[PDB]
Amino acid sequence: DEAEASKFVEEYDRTSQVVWNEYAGANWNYNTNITTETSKILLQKNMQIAQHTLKYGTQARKFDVNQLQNTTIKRIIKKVQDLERAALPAQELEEYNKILLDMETTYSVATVCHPQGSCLQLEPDLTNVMATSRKYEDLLWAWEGWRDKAGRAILQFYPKYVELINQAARLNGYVDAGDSWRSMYETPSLEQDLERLFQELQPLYLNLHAYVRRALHRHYGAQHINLEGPIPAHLLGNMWAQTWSNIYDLVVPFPSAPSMDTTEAMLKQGWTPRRMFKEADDFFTSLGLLPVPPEFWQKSMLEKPTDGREVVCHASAWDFYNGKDFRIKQCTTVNLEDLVVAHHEMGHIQYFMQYKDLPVALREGANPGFHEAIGDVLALSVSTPKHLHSLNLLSSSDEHDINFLMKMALDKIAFIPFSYLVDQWRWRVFDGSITKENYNQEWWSLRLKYQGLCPPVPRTQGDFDPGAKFHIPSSVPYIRYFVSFIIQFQFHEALCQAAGHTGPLHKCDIYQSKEAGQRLATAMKLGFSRPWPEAMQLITGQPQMSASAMLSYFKPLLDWLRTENELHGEKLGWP
Numbered sequence: 051d052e053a054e055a056s057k058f059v060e061e062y063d064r065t066s067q068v069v070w071n072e073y074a075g076a077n078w079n080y081n082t083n084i085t086t087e088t089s090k091i092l093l094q095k096n097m098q099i100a101q102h103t104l105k106y107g108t109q110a111r112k113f114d115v116n117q118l119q120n121t122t123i124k125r126i127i128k129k130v131q132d133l134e135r136a137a138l139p140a141q142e143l144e145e146y147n148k149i150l151l152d153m154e155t156t157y158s159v160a161t162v163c164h165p166q167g168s169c170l171q172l173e174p175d176l177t178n179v180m181a182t183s184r185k186y187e188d189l190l191w192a193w194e195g196w197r198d199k200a201g202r203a204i205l206q207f208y209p210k211y212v213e214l215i216n217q218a219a220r221l222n223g224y225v226d227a228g229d230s231w232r233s234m235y236e237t238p239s240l241e242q243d244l245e246r247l248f249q250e251l252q253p254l255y256l257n258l259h260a261y262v263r264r265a266l267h268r269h270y271g272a273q274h275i276n277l278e279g280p281i282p283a284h285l286l287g288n289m290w291a292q293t294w295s296n297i298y299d300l301v302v303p304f305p306s307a308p309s310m311d312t313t314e315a316m317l318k319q320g321w322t323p324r325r326m327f328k329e330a331d332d333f334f335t336s337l338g339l340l341p342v343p344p345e346f347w348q349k350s351m352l353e354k355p356t357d358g359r360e361v362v363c364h365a366s367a368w369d370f371y372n373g374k375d376f377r378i379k380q381c382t383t384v385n386l387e388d389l390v391v392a393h394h395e396m397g398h399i400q401y402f403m404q405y406k407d408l409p410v411a412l413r414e415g416a417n418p419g420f421h422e423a424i425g426d427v428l429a430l431s432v433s434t435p436k437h438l439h440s441l442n443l444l445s446s447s448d449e450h451d452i453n454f455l456m457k458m459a460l461d462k463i464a465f466i467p468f469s470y471l472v473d474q475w476r477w478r479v480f481d482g483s484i485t486k487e488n489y490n491q492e493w494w495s496l497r498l499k500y501q502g503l504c505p506p507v508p509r510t511q512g513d514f515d516p517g518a519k520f521h522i523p524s525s526v527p528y529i530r531y532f533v534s535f536i537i538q539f540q541f542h543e544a545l546c547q548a549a550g551h552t553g554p555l556h557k558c559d560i561y562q563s564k565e566a567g568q569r570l571a572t573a574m575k576l577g578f579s580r581p582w583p584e585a586m587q588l589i590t591g592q593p594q595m596s597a598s599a600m601l602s603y604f605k606p607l608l609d610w611l612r613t614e615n616e617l618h619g620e621k622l623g624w625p
């Protein structure tokens with residue numbers, strides 16, 4: 051009966067608002083006031099949402115989705131039959147919940163200490179070391195010590211997590227948890243499509259990699275850099291070598307052309323986290339998109355508090371499932387990286403607002419990549435010389451131009467293979483290809499194959515380097531960021547063209563383009579109501595993911611790199 055399916059999705063939606071609101075409320079109260087009291091309330095709300103998932107999921111499974119006419123009710127009910135972890139029996143779910151809590155807490159309290167002196171946390175202490183030290187050994191101490199204290203301590207938990215997370219997946223009809231995750235894209239050709247895309251970025255990444263490799267050989271010496279080999283994983287300015295912009299100063303194409311201290315200028319000019327978020331809000335409203343509601347300004351946590359309260363710092367954006375209350379929680383630092391991350395979180399928020407009228411089961415991005423790309427699009431524009439000049443964090447030529455593209459490459463191209471490899475790895479863990487006997491070996495095999503990195507210190511039994519990246523102990527899928535990095539350029543190219551921009555794509559700045567706002571709004575309003583190629587068509591006028599836009603943005607940089615690498619006889623890649 052068509053009418054019994056309408057009634058059920060109606061009830062599911064009313065009761066999910068209540069129960070999902072209560073839980074997000076409590077997970078926030080925890081996340082911005084870690085107590086044991088806020089841990090008790092969080093744990094009680096877990097149960098309550100499991101018990102709601104089970105009730106509604108068991109009812110949804112009694113429907114034959116084959117016999118159901120209405121496509122919206124059909125899609126809603128098929129998602130509700132997926133209970134996730136709530137599929138697990140009582141004991142196993144208790145244990146699943148506790149392992150995730152344990153994993154994340156171990157990552158969060160891990161420090162690295164010097165004998166007789168100070169213990170450094172990841173944020174900001176070790177991050178600063180990796181960003182500003184130019185001494186092999188000091189980079190190594192932080193790189194190895196972070197792996198030693200965070201990675202190794204996670205390993206004890208990881209086999210039981212894989213077993214429970216695959217058990218939930220199988221009870222929802224998937225083969226393993228990697229299957230489940232990939233199913234969010236609704237794209238059977240996903241693994242092929244993804245690989246094609248990564249293969250089109252290889253000329254840019256190999257050329258950038260070779261050139262940076264030569265620059266590290268200049269600074270750190272011939273005995274430490276093989277000009278025909280992988281780069282050591284601790285010399286790229288970042289704990290995971292996922293972005294390389296902190297070594298902009300070793301790799302400047304045109305040192306002759308001086309570029310400003312964005313960070314010194316922000317401090318110098320009395321930039322606060324609040325001003326940083328107000329700039330993002332303004333950019334969105336320049337586009338004709340939506341302003342954050344007053345409530346967001348009052349309830350958000352835009353900076354680390356100083357009232358004693360302890361908090362989880364990792365930047366995240368929060369939907370409270372009532373169409374009114376949205377929040378960012380970020381221990382914002384006053385600089386450029388964090389201004390871009392503020393944009394990224396603000397794009398999460400914009401999406402929440404745009405799709406607040408859909409039923410909650412459709413309150414998600416058209417795919418996870420879409421969710422991650424929105425803010426980055428606005429930020430490509432923010433980061434232009436023309437725009438930074440107008441915030442008065444830059445002054446202002448071809449030299450300046452290649453310099454800008456290099457800065458961008460180090461944040462965008464560099465991240466391409468890293469974002470690809472995380473879930474390459476996890477997918478093989480979940481499918482049983484990789485066992486705990488070779489978690490670590492297979493990590494490094496992929497670090498080599500995709501990124502062209504090696505570990506400065508030979509790894510040993512008990513090492514578990516993936517546990518040293520947040521997203522692994524916290525069980526947050528990562529392929530979304532690879533997708534985002536591709537599609538964000540596609541979105542920029544389209545909005546730029548909507549906005550009437552002529553000439554090279556990288557000089558485009560879309561500030562105040564109502565046309566660009568429109569293209570994005572109508573896609574974001576769709577939520578998860580339709581298969582994603584529809585949202586792509588809306589934005590870009592075609593329905594494929596495509597590296598064309600990215601290659602085109604960096605084309606001047608590719609030309610330069612190729613002439614430069616050729617001039618030095620670089621041998622691209624690494625046997």
Ligand SMILES: *[C@@H]1O[C@H](CO[C@@H]2O[C@@H](C)[C@@H](O)[C@@H](O)[C@@H]2O)[C@@H](O[C@@H]2O[C@H](CO)[C@@H](O[C@@H]3O[C@H](CO[C@H]4O[C@H](CO)[C@@H](O)[C@H](O[C@H]5O[C@H](CO)[C@@H](O)[C@H](O)[C@@H]5O)[C@@H]4O)[C@@H](O)[C@H](O[C@H]4O[C@H](CO)[C@@H](O)[C@H](O)[C@@H]4O)[C@@H]3O)[C@H](O)[C@H]2NC(C)=O)[C@H](O)[C@H]1NC(C)=O
Pocket residue numbers: 056057059060063120121122123373406407408409410579
């Ligand atoms: C298959 O069924 C689809 C789903 O039907 C809906 O779901 C089931 C479970 C039952 O509840 C149904 O009775 C219900 O219709 C169906 O698709 C729907 O089609 C209608 C058009 O026929 C679309 O309606 C539009 O919705 C806009 C905004 O939606 C929300 O905001 C309203 C603002 O006042 C509000 O009243 C309401 O609020 C709450 O609802 C959701 C629950 O779904 C809840 O989660 C959330 O919290 C909301 O607050 C509403 O949902 C309207 O603004 C829009 O008006 C436009 O038209 C006006 C009149 O011409 C114009 O003046 C104006 O300019 C607008 O352009 C209109 O009412 C509905 O969005 C759509 N549902 C979805 C989610 O896709 C579909 O038709 C069926 N398929 C077939 C082939 O029959």
Ligand SMILES: C[C@H](N[C@@H](CCc1ccccc1)C(=O)O)C(=O)N1[C@H](C(=O)O)C[C@H]2CCCC[C@@H]21
Pocket residue numbers: 292364365366367391394395422524526531
């Ligand atoms: C800061 C950002 N934080 C994530 C949110 C992570 C999270 C998910 C679920 C529960 C708790 C935390 C996000 O906003 O997607 C992040 O981790 N990253 C990822 C990372 O920093 O490794 C990759 C980044 C691409 C550019 C924007 C920031 C992306």
Ligand SMILES: *[C@@H]1O[C@H](CO)[C@@H](O)[C@H](O)[C@H]1NC(C)=O
Pocket residue numbers: 083085087088359
């Ligand atoms: C933090 O700790 C406890 C836990 O609920 C509570 O009594 C206190 O008011 C909380 N403070 C906040 C939210 O600032």
Ligand SMILES: [Cl-]
Pocket residue numbers: 290515516
């Ligand atoms: Cl690593």
Ligand SMILES: [Cl-]
Pocket residue numbers: 231234418419527528529530
């Ligand atoms: Cl994903």
Ligand SMILES: [Zn+2]
Pocket residue numbers: 394395398421422
């Ligand atoms: Zn994000």
